[PDB]
Amino acid sequence: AAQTNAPWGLARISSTSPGTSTYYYDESAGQGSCVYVIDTGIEASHPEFEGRAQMVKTYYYSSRDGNGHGTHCAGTVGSRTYGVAKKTQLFGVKVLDDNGSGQYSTIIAGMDFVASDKNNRNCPKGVVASLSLGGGYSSSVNSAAARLQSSGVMVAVAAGNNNADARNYSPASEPSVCTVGASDRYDRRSSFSNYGSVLDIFGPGTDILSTWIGGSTRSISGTSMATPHVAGLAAYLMTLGKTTAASACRYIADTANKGDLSNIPFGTVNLLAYNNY
Structure with missing residues (x-):
């Protein structure tokens, strides 16, 4: 399948070269997979989600995304126009308040929630979690x-947005998860x-450009935006049967474009x- 005039990042993940604008992908599009977006929530009524998004947990008085950040990340995972895996099921876990902040104890509870909650969902092709969040090193968060x-x-x-070594941030510094740095259109x-040996991949x-609250769209920057590209890619590859949850980070690294980035x-x-593809 081909999506013309796609956001540059979608075109980039299906290309051997920068500077193109069509996203190419197998039409299976992550069908039968699920991605948890552990963030500020998801505005699930956005037309871009087509009924495939739902909130499954909040730690706050509401499950509404009053910020936008979670909606944006969910859109890069799986929205019809802005998403990598355009047929995945999206599950929102609101561990961050509407200012984008959350206590580590709440973030930990949300991660353990997903580990159990996947047993309440139908995800025959596999399960992904996208964590566009982090703070200073915590062994409990990494665990x-x-x-x-x-x-x-x-x-x-x-990986985090400090232009620093990710070893000092969590959950970025956890070795067994997939730690994602950010690149630009060039x-x-x-x-x-952030950078360092703990990074596994760039996106x-x-x-x-992705979805935003109030049924809108906007373009923002961060390693928060790179992470859902990799999460959506994992869901897409799991639907194709190419890899599994335990091996997808390694598979993505093994099949990545190598030696293309500067600085x-x-x-x-x-x-x-x-x-x-």
Whole structure:
């Protein structure tokens, strides 16, 4: 399948080269997979979600996304126009308040929630969790992400936006999950992207158009925007039967575009997520 005039990041993940604008993907499109977006919530009535999004948990007085950040990330995973996996099922877990903030204890509870809640959902092709959040190093946060991965969920986490080594941030620094850096449309490391040996992969993260609250759209930047590209890619590849939740990060790294990015510090992988379609 081909989507013309796609957001640059979608075109990038199906291309061997930067500078094109059509997204190419197998029409299965992640059908039968599920992706949990652990964030500020999802405005599930957005027409772009087509009834495939739903809230499954909040830790706050409402499940509404009063921020936009979770809606944007969910759109990059799975919206019809802005999403990588256009037929996946999206599940919102609101661990962040409408200012985008959350306590680590709530974030941990949300990760353990997903590890159990997937047993209440129909995801025959597999389960992914996208965590566009993080803060300073916490062994408890890293352990929660490790448990979620161990339970059979492909966990993709943002590297962080500090232009620093991700080893000092969580859950970015957890070795067993997929830690995602950000790139721009010219195949440069995004200026804010964290780096370091703990990164597994880069995805598009500068100037990413997606869904927003109030039935709208906007373009924003962050490793938060790169992470859902990789989460959606994992769901897509699991639907195709190419990989599994336990192996998808490694598979994505093995099949990535190699050596295409600039300003990658010595010791950080030079790997850009690629669907090889």
